[PDB]
Amino acid sequence: CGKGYHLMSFPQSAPHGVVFLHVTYVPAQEKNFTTAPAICHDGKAHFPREGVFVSNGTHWFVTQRNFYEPQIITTDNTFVSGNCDVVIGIVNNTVYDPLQPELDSFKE
Amino acid sequence: AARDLICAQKFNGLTVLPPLLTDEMIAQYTSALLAGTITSGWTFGAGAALQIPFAMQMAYRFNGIGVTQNVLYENQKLIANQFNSAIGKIQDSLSSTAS
Ligand SMILES: *[C@@H]1O[C@H](CO)[C@@H](O[C@@H]2O[C@H](CO)[C@@H](O)[C@H](O)[C@H]2NC(C)=O)[C@H](O)[C@H]1NC(C)=O
Ligand SMILES: *[C@@H]1O[C@H](CO)[C@@H](O)[C@H](O)[C@H]1NC(C)=O
Ligand SMILES: *[C@@H]1O[C@H](CO)[C@@H](O)[C@H](O)[C@H]1NC(C)=O
């Protein structure tokens, strides 16, 4: 159904045949990034749910694969599996918790 | 020596034409496909080749099956050794059996 990631197709008639217009999605402008498989935070290894860890040079973000939009590494978009001494290539970064600011505000 | 069969075919008007692509060109195409699918994953078949480490590509391919990616990263030496044994058995199967 055409070269690339297929979105649509439209038929047209022709003498003794058919013609398909395949509408596809092509990635265009790429750039290099530094990546890691997991984040070792607080003795726990964090893996992305639907995405990949990238670095712009100083900080670490999680992003989708086919498009570049970054967001903060969070407990909501990651999951925990074991401790950080088995995975090869772990890096150290903090993981934000959205519960804790509203949790401490309720506590005080 | 003696009269070959191919010489008799040539003398009787039967000719074999060579193919357009040599075996070196087929080998170059195969090597290009292997290098692309090793270094870039499936991205070279949908546009520009985007590099990715092989363990992360294999974790993507495990998420394509139904297994979460924590299985590969905690067992990477086992999948590596199993793949090495499986590809080493192909040479031993091809060096003996001609069927
Ligand atoms: C990597 O991205 C982060 C997040 O966007 C950048 O951090 C911010 O950068 C802006 C742009 O100058 C600053 O105004 C903010 O004060 C920065 N915030 C923090 C918390 O540092 C960071 O600069 C980027 N790094 C590179 C090398 O591009
Ligand atoms: C990424 O890095 C390589 C090697 O450092 C370089 O050739 C290339 O231009 C860079 N950028 C992109 C978009 O690939
Ligand atoms: C990450 O932090 C742990 C302790 O929190 C430390 O033992 C480890 O060496 C750090 N990793 C790196 C690459 O420095």
Record the tokens describing residue B66, joined without a space: 């139904």
* Structure-token pair, residue A15: 């003498």
Residues with CB under 6 A from ligand 3: A 40, 92
Nearest alpha carbon to residue A6 among A25, A30, A31, A33: A25
Q: How far apart are CA A15 and CA A12, in angstroms?
A: 10
Reported resolution, Å: 3.1
Answer whether A27 sits within 8 Å of B48, measured CB to CB.
yes
What values do phi and psi take at B76, rounded to 5?
-65, -35
**Cβ contact B53:A35 at 8 Å:** yes
- Contact criterion met (CB below 8 Å) for B44 and B33: no
b/e string for A19-40 if b means 16 or more Cβ within 10 A?
A: eeeeeeeeeeeeeeeebbbbbb
Closest-CA residue to B46 (of A71, A90, A92, A4)? A4
A58 torsion bin: left (phi>0), alpha (psi -120 to 50), beta (else): alpha
Record the tokens describing residue A20, joined without a space.
């398909």
Report which DSSP code applies to B41.
T
Nearest-angstrom CA–CA distance, B98 and B22? 25
Query: Counting atoms of ligand 1 from 1, which one is nearest the CA of A57?
Result: 27
* B78 CA from centroid of ligand 3 (Å): 25
A30 CB near ligand 2 (under 6 Å): yes
Give the three-state DSSP class for A84: coil
What backbone torsions phi and psi does residue A63 show, to the nearest 5 degrees? -140, 160
Task: Report the C-alpha gap between A78 and A52 in whole angstroms.
Answer: 10
Neighbouring C-alpha atoms within 13 Å toward the C-beta of A28: 2
User: Is the minimum CB–CB distance between A3 and chain B shorter than 8 Å?
Assistant: yes
CB A26 within 8 A of CB A78: no
Quote the radius of gyration of chain A (alpha carbons, Å).
21
Closest chain B residue to the Cα of A83, Cα to Cα: B74
Residue A89, phi-psi category: left (phi > 0), alpha (psi -120 to 50), beta (remainder): left
Structure tokens at B50: 């985007």
Residue B18: DSSP 8-state: P
CA distance A89 to A34: 12
Residue count of chain B: 99
Please give the Cα distance from A65 to A60 (Å, whole number): 15
What does the buried/exposed string (b/e) look like for B25-52 if buried means 16 or more CB atoms within 10 Å of the residue's CB? eeeeeeeeeeeeeebbbebbebbebbeb
